[PDB]
Amino acid sequence: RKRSHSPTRYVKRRF
Amino acid sequence: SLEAIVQNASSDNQGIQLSAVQAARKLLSSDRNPPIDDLIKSGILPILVHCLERDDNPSLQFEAAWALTNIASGTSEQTQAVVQSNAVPLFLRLLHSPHQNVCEQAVWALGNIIGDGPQCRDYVISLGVVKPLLSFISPSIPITFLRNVTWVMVNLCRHKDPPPPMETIQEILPALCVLIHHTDVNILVDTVWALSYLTDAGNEQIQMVIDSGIVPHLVPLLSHQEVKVQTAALRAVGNIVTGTDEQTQVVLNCDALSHFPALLTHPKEKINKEAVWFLSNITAGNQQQVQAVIDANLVPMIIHLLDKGDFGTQKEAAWAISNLTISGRKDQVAYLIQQNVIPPFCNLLTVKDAQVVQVVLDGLSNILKMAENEDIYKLAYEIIDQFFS
């Protein structure tokens, strides 16, 4: 049957 | 000079307070290990949140938004502290400022806040961020501001449990349809990752994405010049084909399988394995879709990967072959055996992965019929009893 992808905080600083 | 900075920031001399705020911004916007925790302990948060409300001093507002943005770039606890300071509503209000810098920095800070977790995401959504965020979508926007907006959209779509509200999904998808036609590689990558996250949620979300009418723009990007775009689009279409056969056929109607020879022969084993995973999900569908896969001449490459590829790609190829054997007609299984699949499909039987071993055994048993774990030994015995004996 159909299978889903395996399980795998995006913050960005300003410099 | 952290506490002197704090006290000077709590001043009504605009010069002194702005100097202290930009000094704190410098401290927090340079060294890889910034003094976020100590500046929080010194009580800079309420002062900065207060400064955000000073519409008469736009540069003070901007520098405070900068400092809070970088404070929210630390630990989850520090982002939650920023949230507790009552900074989100003031950012939401400054989105409508007559000066573009405060607006863009507020978008940045709200993106950092939303990216922390689904609960903060839902709070910022409840306060109504999506409409003013997407109002900035215009041809006259600078690409930097548009990149930040697209990154915020990705953050909004990212989290799975709980998934984003259906109404926010509905508002975001049209903007993704507008942005999928952009030249900027960063914008395109962000858009594709966002709709990938949306397609990883569920079948009704997949159906909404299909209703938007963007899948035919997504499929071509499988052959985009940029590997990042290619990988994002590959995972997105993979998610979509994990749903119903109807949605899988919608994906296949955009001539998607034409893009997969290059992905199967790509030097990157991660691209290889994701492509083989897509093709396994396709082989787990209708016999007509199995026939389509066979016609695209991808089966020999799948078998070559099963034979000599990375072990993860080998597992995914075993899955694809087994799904084809159980969901394929006798002529298609005959084609498979004609393409010399038995030796490599058998060599995997020695691996430790019980799942892949059982998949191989099941494929072999079903092929023969068409012609530790209890589940494994039982199949080994059943196959041996029927075919060995």
Residue numbers in the entry:
A (entry chain B): 22 to 29, 33 to 39
B (entry chain A): 72 to 442, 469 to 486
Authors' description from the paper:
The MERS-CoV ORF4b protein is a viral accessory protein that functions as an innate immune inhibitor and strongly localizes to the nucleus, despite virus replication occurring exclusively within the cytoplasmic compartment. The MERS-CoV ORF4b protein has been shown to bind preferentially to the nuclear import adapter IMPα3 in infected cells, thereby inhibiting NF-κB-dependent innate immune responses. Here we provide a detailed, structural basis for the interaction between MERS-CoV ORF4b and its innate immune suppression target, the nuclear import adapter IMPα. Our results provide a detailed structural basis that explains how a virus can target the IMPα nuclear import adapter to impair immunity, and illustrate how small mutations in ORF4b, like those found in closely related coronaviruses such as HKU5, change the IMPα binding mechanism.
Because the results indicated that MERS-CoV ORF4b NLS was able to bind IMPα isoforms with high affinity and showed little preference for a specific isoform, we examined the molecular interface with two IMPα isoforms using high-resolution structural approaches. Specifically, we crystallized the MERS-CoV ORF4b NLS bound to both IMPα2 and IMPα3 and resolved the structures to 2.1 Å and 2.5 Å resolution respectively. F Crystal structure of MERS-CoV ORF4b NLS bound to IMPα3 at 2.5 Å resolution. Our high-resolution crystal structures showed that MERS-CoV ORF4b occupies an extensive interface across both IMPα2 and IMPα3. Strikingly, the binding interface of both structures lacked a Lys at the P2 position within the major site that is seen with other NLSs. Surprisingly, MERS ORF4b does not contain a Lys at the P2 site, but rather a Val (position 35), which did not form any interactions with the Gly150, Thr155, and Asp192 pocket. Rather, MERS ORF4b bound IMPα2 and IMPα3 through an Arg residue (position 33, the equivalent of the P0 position) at this site and formed similar interactions to those made by a Lys NZ nitrogen at the P2 site. Paradoxically, this interaction interface was very similar in both the nuclear import adapter IMPα2 and in IMPα3, the latter of which ORF4b reportedly exhibited a binding preference.
